[PDB]
Amino acid sequence: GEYVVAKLDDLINWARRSSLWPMTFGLACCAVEMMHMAAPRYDMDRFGVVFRASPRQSDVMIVAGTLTNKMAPALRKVYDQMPEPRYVVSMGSCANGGGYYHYSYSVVRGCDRIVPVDIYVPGCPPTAEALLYGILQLQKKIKREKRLRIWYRR
């Protein structure tokens, strides 16, 4: 029982982190470096992170750019339509905490006011390599999960 649950989490954690299908909100600048992560030099697809997905087939949402008050409701709705398990990666200063528009009347001061965030990737923009480091950091975070061990001990 205890042994099986440990190896079973190992399996599903391996599957979910080895097949991370992202939905990217290309909101602004940071989406350019996001495209460079899909470009041949880094080739995010080689890690199992597919190129195109669809909101309803996605595992991770990458908020790549500034989130304005006008866009906030639409971003929350996409997050609400994602099937679980779902993760959010906050990419760049704007999505992290408002960044260079932090004091603007029309900017959400961090996307973590709208959705829960798993990883914060600093930079303006973070380099494509910095984003890839954050994506591989999220895989390690998933590798640490213990859904069945916790469930079995309820």
Binding site: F25, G26, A28, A31, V32, A39, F51, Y100, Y101, C124
Partner: protein
């Protein structure tokens, strides 16, 4: 009926999110209502609380595919109100990196234009080239995109030794890369079926709707601000302006591909004609002195201290200054009240007028022709929304 085009493609794309409210009858588009503002960040109001140096990085983040070109427009506007002149080596560097930036923009414009239509392979081939040009940005500035390199007075730093040879190496092979792109698209009957006679705009309608750049030249209008109203050293380089004949998406696509070839032609002259000398105006009341001077000379330290706190004061006045940005005429209406912070800074984004013409250009076209028409205008909602 009534539709709403999605915010963006399912594949990764960097140009912003659009809310397009569409009227259709059958397959035909009856009305397009672009609802923008989804990336409006109040840049112009923020600039009013910044000194003239502090506001420069805001311009990298407008048309955030043409970073240094946006910097150059702002720098020219400030240099004009200051009544100073950047040194000749800085002007050559600014034209050199202006054309490198034009390559960056046109690769993004053309290959994402194909990527949205479904021709996705050229995107991957050509962003390996963009990756190498990001290395040029990072080597002069330390940043791959938002360099903040071009500044009123010249450029922040001089080219590192060995940079020009590497730029030559890249430029040597680039025309072949354009040739491979054309092999996939230029004569492809599917690409032509998606672009030829799509989004036709007449020369007179283009002018009255406020278009600029390729949106004018695709209709046969013989206008290029680098030729007619030259800035920096553009009057010392030789290049041809591509002109279209049918005013449609296919002719504008060819113009952008030919403009890429002319940019390589211009870069070749900048590499050969780069003169020696200083990189920022030798005027420590505008451009900060060298760090070695700041640490030895009393005058230099005072001017360093004041330039990095209060900033330089700009004589009162207002200018509208524009350049031939990769996306069309990019201008700034900059108002000075005599202090060290701008009083007003309106940004003229070429895509603002272009997206206002989408309703006109899409009349009597199919739902999928709207995809191609926003593609041919090359819209970045960072500059449309400010």
């Amino acid at each position: 009926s009534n539709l709403t085009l999605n915010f963006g493609p399912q594949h990764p794309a960097a140009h912003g999110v659009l809310r397009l409210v569409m009227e259709l009858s059958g397959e035909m588009v009856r009305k397009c209502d672009p609802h923008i503002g989804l990336l409006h960040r109040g840049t112009e109001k923020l600039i009013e609380y910044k000194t003239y140096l502090q506001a420069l990085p805001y311009f990298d983040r407008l048309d955030y595919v043409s970073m240094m070109c946006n910097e150059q427009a702002y720098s020219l506007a400030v240099e004009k109100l200051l009544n100073i002149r950047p040194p000749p080596r800085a002007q050559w560097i600014r034209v050199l990196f202006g054309e490198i930036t034009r390559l960056l923009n046109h690769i993004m414009a053309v290959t994402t234009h194909a990527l949205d239509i479904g021709a996705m392979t050229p995107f991957f081939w050509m962003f390996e080239e963009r990756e190498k040009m990001f290395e040029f940005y990072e080597r002069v500035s330390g940043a791959r995109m938002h360099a903040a390199y071009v500044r009123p007075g010249g450029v922040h730093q001089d080219l590192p030794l060995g940079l020009m040879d590497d730029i030559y190496e890249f430029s040597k092979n680039f025309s072949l890369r354009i040739d491979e792109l054309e092999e996939m698209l230029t004569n492809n009957r599917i690409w032509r079926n998606r672009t030829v006679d799509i989004g036709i705009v007449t020369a007179e309608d283009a002018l009255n709707y406020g278009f600029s750049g390729v949106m004018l030249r695709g209709s046969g209008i013989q206008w290029d601000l680098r030729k007619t109203q030259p800035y920096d050293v553009y009057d010392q380089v030789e290049f041809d302006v591509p002109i279209g004949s049918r005013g449609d998406c296919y002719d504008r696509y060819l113009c952008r591909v030919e403009e890429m070839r002319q940019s390589i032609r211009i870069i070749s002259q900048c590499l050969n004609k780069m003169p020696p000398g200083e990189i920022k105006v030798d005027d420590a009341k505008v451009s900060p002195p060298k760090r070695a001077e700041m640490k030895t000379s009393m005058e230099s330290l005072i001017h360093h201290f004041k330039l990095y706190t209060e900033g330089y004061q700009v004589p009162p006045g207002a200018t509208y200054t524009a350049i031939e940005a990769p996306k069309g005429e990019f201008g700034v209406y900059l108002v000075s009240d005599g202090s060290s912070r701008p009083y007003r800074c309106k940004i003229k984004a070429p895509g603002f007028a272009h997206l206002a013409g989408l309703d006109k250009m899409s009349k009597g076209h199919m739902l999928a022709d709207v995809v191609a028409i926003i593609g041919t205008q090359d819209i970045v909602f960072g500059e449309v929304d400010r």
